[PDB]
């Protein structure tokens, strides 16, 4: 079904106007995963920096979400897990040599400092965003600090500890019947897909890389059990995909879902590790090929949340999120960077663009036709809302 269509530039939709909300806490940039770690909370600052030098503060309202407490966080995890997070510190780690192996928090995602505080900030942001949507003061909530979608119910796997996307979706589900979770990080969002695998009120659709790559999950045949048969859409792509192929796969699947699932609230996980040049990711996308998808989701005009995600090189991800926010506010942003405090990272051209490499594209069109054919054939049965 896939048909090669070239890259049409991204443009602002004229009529779709909406009163958004930007959540930012002034402290989260201090944390820092110890030494050499691919994800770090410096890139949460740089983004905000640009939004404050481009002057988007006149275009939308920025808040700071009061943090989540233990009872509120424990809507998903088990008491023991949340508590062990709230207690651990690198001085008395030795006291915990049983739990620190049960819960996986000592090896790939170490314990550094402010851990509980950082996780609480992200969780509180996500929840207050869903709530303000829910209550309805706004129509969008960006939360570039949250988005920890690998954190399972009782183990923190993949550098992320508190799985705030699930809390946000629950607070969304308190009022809205059906919610659609669109994931475009290169890895597979196994946390959310698992934690809504046996339900029909939340439909998760993840475009990820398959092969010997973290976390080895997300085949095409995982399509939900129980009452939630045919309510999960995993799309396994192959290496080296470019912006044109990614758009040509994305657009029809999302249109088909929103034709048949008819969600009342969208949650879009806007990760940045699908970009060209990341330490972890292997795709070859640009800035335009990544903003195009968020533009497409916004086009329909549903109350939505945009959440952050990965990010392994703070330059690409910082500029990408500044561009995505600009796009969400019906403003095409000027391609020249103003003067900001972190002006030094963006060399050598000192521009707002991200450049793709000449890595070799592997996604053969026949492969895509077979995948989209299987997915449409499955989704033929979600026609009843």
């Amino acid at each position: 079904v896939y048909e090669a269509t070239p890259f049409d530039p991204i443009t602002v939709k004229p009529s779709d106007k909406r009163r958004v909300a930007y959540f930012y806490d002034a402290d989260v940039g201090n944390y820092a995963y110890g030494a050499g770690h691919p994800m770090k909370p410096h890139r949460i600052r740089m983004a905000h920096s640009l939004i404050m030098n481009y002057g988007l503060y006149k275009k939308m309202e920025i808040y700071r979400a009061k943090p989540a407490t233990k009872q509120e966080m424990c809507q998903f995890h088990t008491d023991e897990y949340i508590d062990f997070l709230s207690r651990v510190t690198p001085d008395n780690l030795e006291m915990f040599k049983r739990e620190s192996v049960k819960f996986n928090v000592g090896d790939d995602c170490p314990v550094f400092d402010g851990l509980y505080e950082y996780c609480s900030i992200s969780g509180g942001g996500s929840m207050e965003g869903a709530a303000r949507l829910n209550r309805g003061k706004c129509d969008v909530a960006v939360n570039y600090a949250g988005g920890l979608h690998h954190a399972k119910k009782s183990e923190a796997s993949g550098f992320c500890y508190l799985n705030d996307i699930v809390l946000g979706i629950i607070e969304l589900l308190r009022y809205h019947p059906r919610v659609l979770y669109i994931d475009i990080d290169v890895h597979h969002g196994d946390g959310v897909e698992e934690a809504f695998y046996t339900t029909d009120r939340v439909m998760t659709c993840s475009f990820h890389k398959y092969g010997e790559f973290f976390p080895g999950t997300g085949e095409l045949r995982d399509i939900g059990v129980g009452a939630g048969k045919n309510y999960a859409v995993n799309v396994p792509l192959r290496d080296g995909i470019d912006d044109a192929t990614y758009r040509s796969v994305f657009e029809p699947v999302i249109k088909k879902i929103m034709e048949w699932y008819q969600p009342s609230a969208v949650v879009l996980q806007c990760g940045g590790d699908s970009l060209s040049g990341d330490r972890l990711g292997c795709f070859n996308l640009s800035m335009e090929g990544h903003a195009n998808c968020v533009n497409y989701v916004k086009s329909f005009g549903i109350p939505m949340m945009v959440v952050g995600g990965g990010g392994y090189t703070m330059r690409n991800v910082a500029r990408t999120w500044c561009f995505e926010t600009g796009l969400l506010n019906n403003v095409v942003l000027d391609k020249d960077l103003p003067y900001n405090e972190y002006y030094e990272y963006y060399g050598p051209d000192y521009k707002l663009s991200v450049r793709p490499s000449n890595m070799f594209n592997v996604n053969t069109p026949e492969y895509l036709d077979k995948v989209m054919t299987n997915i449409f054939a499955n989704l033929e049965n979600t026609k009843y809302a």
Binding site: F23, Y24, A26, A35, H48, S49, M52, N53, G55, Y57, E61, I62, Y63, R64, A65, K66, A68, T69, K70, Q71, E72, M73, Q75, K97, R98, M127, E128, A131, R132, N134, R135, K137, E171, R174, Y210, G211, E212, L220, P236, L237, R238, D239, G240, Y339, N340, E341, F360, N361, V362, T364, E366, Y367, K370, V371, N374
Partner: protein
């Protein structure tokens, strides 16, 4: 403060001359924020308040590494779970911990006369178990260990061989790449996934001809002045019919966990769903297996462990031809009879009206 950081030197120090030589050629608006952020606590749940013998580095019970307690009286050490009963690391034994064997020795005081005496005592008490007596006495004197199958039963099957740590490995596991990680850091970008290099993967090595794709019958080799028409031929490990990664729709090179199997290997399980179980034995290899030729070749059913020839029950091609014709024609007959009874009940209920 003088302690080196990631940069190579103290933090309050500029670059050395060696680095700057080999690395050279020769108001803002986020002052604000504490004025625009106003807290949000609009959430629904805001009501919620919220003699020096050196010990081992191995579990001599399971010969794998871990966090282990060591012995005060013999060099043998175990993980905290490998004891009977297993000991909690939170409440360690107050004082020296003595293994089963050394505790045994000090209980017997190195006097075998008391050994034979208490053996006679034990066999005197429970004459009820006069046979198992020796073992019932000795069980408390041997140090624990995991349970390894006796080799005389691992030999009954040839395709069952132990892994590195004493684990089941039934030859469906590819191999220990080991040195391939050094290979993974290839000097020339030619990594395992075989990206941008498929000239001589489309061509058999020994023979020299082309590897055809059973489903589309073309080794699509493209042209390495125009590589966008390759199609990544890969070959199975059992039957070796070469397939396209686009015919068997999977998109990855199975290279780490197991060996890949074509869609041309029949079952190895059933799940009848109306839900019965296996139809296949294991590989009861060697001389011990008995092959049995039937005396009747038309309605003998016997198993699903058939072996085809020109307790494993051999059979000929024409026999299975006949048996499948039997299935087909009995199925068409019973389907016709079901339609017949359906229509005849229909006619009975019509003529009743």
């Amino acid at each position: 403060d003088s302690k080196v950081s990631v940069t190579g030197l103290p933090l309050n120090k500029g670059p050395s001359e060696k680095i700057k030589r080999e690395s050279l050629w020769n108001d803002l608006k986020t002052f604000l924020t504490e004025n625009m952020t106003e807290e949000s606590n609009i959430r629904s749940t805001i009501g919620w308040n919220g003699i020096d013998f050196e010990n081992e580095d191995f579990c001599s019970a399971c010969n794998q590494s871990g966090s282990f307690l060591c012995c005060d009286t013999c060099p043998k050490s175990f993980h905290f779970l490998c004891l009977d009963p297993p000991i909690d690391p939170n409440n360690l034994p107050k004082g020296d911990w003595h293994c089963n064997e050394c505790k045994f020795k000090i209980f017997i005081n190195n006097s075998m006369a008391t050994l034979k005496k208490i053996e006679s005592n034990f066999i005197k008490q429970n004459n009820n178990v006069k046979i198992f007596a020796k073992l019932l006495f000795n069980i408390d004197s041997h140090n624990p260990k995991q349970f390894q199958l006796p080799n005389y039963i691992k030999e009954t099957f040839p395709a069952v061989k132990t892994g590195s740590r004493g684990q089941y490995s039934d030859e469906n596991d590819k191999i220990p790449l080991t040195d391939r990680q050094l290979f993974n850091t290839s000097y020339g970008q030619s990594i395992t996934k075989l990206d941008s290099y498929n000239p001589d993967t489309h061509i058999d090595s020994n023979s020299g001809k082309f590897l055809i794709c059973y489903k589309c019958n073309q080794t699509r080799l493209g042209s390495w002045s125009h590589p966008e028409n390759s199609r990544l031929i890969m070959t199975c490990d059992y039957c070796q019919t070469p397939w396209h990664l686009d015919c068997v729709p999977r998109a990855s090179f199975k290279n780490l966990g197991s060996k890949w199997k074509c869609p041309l290997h029949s079952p190895t399980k059933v799940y009848k769903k109306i839900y019965k179980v296996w139809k296949k034995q294991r590989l009861i290899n060697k001389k011990n297996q008995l092959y049995y030729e039937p005396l009747q070749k038309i309605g003998y059913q016997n198993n699903g462990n058939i072996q085809i020839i020109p307790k494993i029950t051999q059979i000929d091609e024409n026999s299975i031809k006949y048996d499948f014709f039997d299935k087909i024609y009995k199925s068409k007959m019973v389907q016709k009879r079901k339609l017949f009874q359906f229509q005849e009940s229909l006619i009975d209920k019509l003529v009743s009206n």
